[PDB]
């Protein structure tokens, strides 16, 4: 909407206070004009029609329990926008400052979040498996990264290309979490997953097997569930990414870590310059080796480490 840019204040899902960019025109709307062509957050009102209504508030204060998922969707979209712009010189998901839209309070007891081809969508969870999913910065960045992938490599959402698609979202979700620097880790969704159980998460990049996800190509799932295991086989690539950044010895193969910033540069270049809609794991290895070669040189430690990491997870 047309209005004047303002700054509201509220509390997120975990009870933390934060400032949010809003727009005033009769009401205060969750419309952040400070980033690209805007970040817009909508209320789906427990229904499934999208996007719903642009979030409107009478007083620019967002401290109601019902407000919390909107506060976090809006704020963490901003953080993710900043990450891509400041770190990768990418302006929004399309590279041309496309408006970023999110809807919260989607459906009832909805234990998931997704990119629907045009916008991000967040369930509130059922209070047992999840609390409102926008409370996780890694989750928000995971979802916006699906949009980045769709506008770039275009990895088809099934089988190996789909597992790469998933891993790319977990990787950048995690790198954004580190960028914001609040309780960062290599786990996925820990902030909003199972409020009754401490210390767990939906997936782990450092040890995917803790939740029965594969950490070696020999253990890949080849059935039909979950689009051919896109959220399962992502473990193989997530493990490789973790090893590239942090190092380690995995099934006897030692990897020299090169750090998160270089992981991010290598995988962003692979995603945007080399991967295609049908890339498989072997092709991702080649893309990452080439990307590291472009950035650091053929004889670099960085190139050697990428190779070590893919060797370690059994991808040739
Ligand atoms: C199991 N879910 C997840 O891993 C994450 C949420 C996680 C980070 C909390 N959500 P996601 O974005 O991977 C779920 N997406 C999904 O199932 O895609 C189906 C689809 C939905 C709409 C259009 C096309 C395809
Ligand atoms: Ca209010
Ligand atoms: Ca964390
Ligand atoms: Ca995390
Ligand atoms: Ca938990
Ligand atoms: Zn995903």
Say which CATH number the domain at 294 has: 1.10.390.10
* DSSP class of 63: -
Burial of 49 (0-12, 13-18, 19+ CB in 10 A): exposed
Binding annotation for Ca(2+)? 57, 59, 61, 138, 177, 183, 185, 187, 190, 193-194, 197, 200
The percent of the chain in helix, strand and coil, each rounded to the nearest 5, is: 40, 20, 40
Can you give the length of the chain in residues? 316
Closest residue by Cα to atom 22, ligand 1, is 116
- Of the residues 154, 186, 205, the one at which a domain ends: 154
Dump the DSSP string for 165-206: HHHHHHHHHHHHHHHHTSS--SEESTTTB-TTSTT--SEESS
**How many domains does the chain fold into?**
2
Give yes or no: residues 129 and 40 share one domain: yes
Closest residue by Cα to atom 23, ligand 1, is 116
Q: CA 99, CA 94: separation in Å to the nearest integer?
A: 9
Binding annotation? 57, 59, 61, 138, 142, 146, 166, 177, 183, 185, 187, 190, 193-194, 197, 200
Q: Which two tokens stand for residue 279?
A: 């890339």
SS3 211: helix
SS3 276: coil
* Matching residue, tokens 């490789």: 240
Is 185 inside a domain boundary?
yes
For residue 41, what are the contacts with CB-CB under 8 A and spacing of at least 6? 30, 31, 54, 55, 70, 73, 74, 77, 101, 102, 103, 104
Distance of CA 193 to the CA centre of its chain: 15
CA 299 → CA 114, 199, 244, 304, distances in Å? 40, 40, 16, 8
Closest ligand 1 atom to 117 CA: 23
CA 313 → CA 23, 194, 247, distances in Å? 48, 29, 13
For residue 84, what are the contacts with CB-CB under 8 A and spacing of at least 6? 90, 91, 92, 93, 148
Rounded to a whole number of angstroms, the distance between the first and last alpha carbons of the chain is 51
The rounded Å distance from CA 276 to ligand 3 centre is 31
Q: Which two tokens stand for residue 53?
A: 């209504």
CB 198 within 8 A of CB 316: no
Ligand 1: list residues with CB < 6 Å. Answer: 112-117, 133, 139, 142-143, 146, 157, 188-189, 202, 231
Look at residues 289, 197, 209, 192 and name the one whose alpha carbon lies nearest to residue 251. Answer: 209
CA 54 → CA 3, 40, 129, 147, distances in Å? 13, 7, 28, 20
Give yes or no: residues 32 and 175 share one domain: no
Give yes or no: residues 145 and 285 share one domain: no
CA 46 → CA 74, 105, 123, distances in Å? 18, 5, 9
Closest ligand 1 atom to 146 CA: 12
The rounded Å distance from CA 63 to ligand 2 centre is 7
CA 50 → CA 53, 102, 115, 120, 193, distances in Å? 8, 9, 12, 10, 24
> Within 10 Å of residue 40's Cβ, how many Cβ atoms?
23
Give yes or no: residues 214 and 300 share one domain: yes
Q: Do the bridges between strand 39-43 and strand 31-32 make them parallel or antiparallel, or are there none, so unpaired?
A: antiparallel
The rounded Å distance from CA 309 to ligand 5 centre is 29
Q: CA 100, CA 37: separation in Å to the nearest integer?
A: 8
Residues annotated as catalytic (active site), given as ranges: 143, 231
- 187 φ, ψ (degrees, to nearest 5): -105, 160
Look at residues 4, 8, 315, 12 and name the one whose alpha carbon lies nearest to residue 163. Answer: 315
- 41 φ, ψ (degrees, to nearest 5): -120, 135
The number of C-alpha atoms within 13 Å of 221 and in the hemisphere containing its C-beta is 22
Q: CA 1, CA 8: separation in Å to the nearest integer?
A: 17
Q: CA 236, CA 216: separation in Å to the nearest integer?
A: 5
- 108 φ, ψ (degrees, to nearest 5): -125, 130
- Of the residues 127, 154, 181, the one at which a domain ends: 154
> Within 10 Å of residue 119's Cβ, how many Cβ atoms?
18
Is 1 inside a domain boundary?
no
Task: Show the domain range for 38.
Answer: 6-154
Give yes or no: residues 190 and 214 share one domain: yes
Q: CA 269, CA 274: separation in Å to the nearest integer?
A: 7
For residue 63, what are the contacts with CB-CB under 8 A and spacing of at least 6? 10, 11
Closest ligand 1 atom to 157 CA: 25
Closest residue by Cα to atom 20, ligand 1, is 116
Q: CA 163, CA 282: separation in Å to the nearest integer?
A: 12
């Amino acid at each position: 909407i047309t209005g004047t840019s303002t700054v509201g204040v509220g509390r997120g899902v975990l009870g933390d206070q934060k400032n949010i960019n809003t727009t005033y025109s009769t009401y205060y709307y969750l419309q952040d004009n400070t980033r690209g062509n805007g970040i817009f957050t909508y209320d789906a009102k427990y229904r499934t029609t999208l996007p719903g209504s642009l979030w409107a508030d009478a007083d620019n204060q967002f401290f109601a329990s019902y407000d919390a998922p909107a506060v976090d969707a809006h704020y963490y979209a901003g953080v993710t926008y900043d990450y891509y712009k400041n770190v990768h010189n990418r302006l929004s998901y399309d590279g041309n400052n496309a408006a970023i839209r999110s809807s919260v309070h989607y459906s009832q007891g909805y234990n998931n979040a997704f990119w629907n081809g045009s916008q991000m969508v967040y369930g509130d969870g059922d209070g047992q498996t999840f609390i409102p999913l926008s409370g996780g910065i890694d989750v928000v960045a995971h979802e916006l990264t699906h949009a980045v992938t769709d506008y770039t490599a275009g990895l088809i959402y099934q089988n190996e290309s789909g597992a790469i698609n998933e891993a790319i979202s977990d990787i950048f979700g995690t790198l954004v979490e580190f960028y914001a620097n609040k309780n960062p880790d290599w786990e996925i969704g820990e902030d909003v997953y199972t409020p009754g159980i401490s210390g767990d998460s939906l997936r782990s990049m450092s040890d995917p097997a803790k939740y029965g996800d594969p950490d070696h190509y020999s253990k890949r799932y080849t059935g039909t569930q979950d689009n051919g295991g896109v959220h399962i086989n992502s473990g193989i690539i997530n493990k490789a990414a973790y090893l590239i950044s942090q190092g380690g010895t995995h099934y006897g193969v030692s990897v020299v870590g090169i750090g998160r910033d270089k992981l991010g540069k290598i995988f962003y270049r692979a995603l945007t310059q080399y991967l295609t809609p049908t890339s498989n794991f072997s092709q991702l290895r080649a893309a990452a080796v080439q990307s590291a070669t472009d950035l650091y040189g053929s004889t670099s430690q960085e190139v050697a480490s990428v190779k070590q990491a893919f060797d370690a997870v059994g991808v040739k």
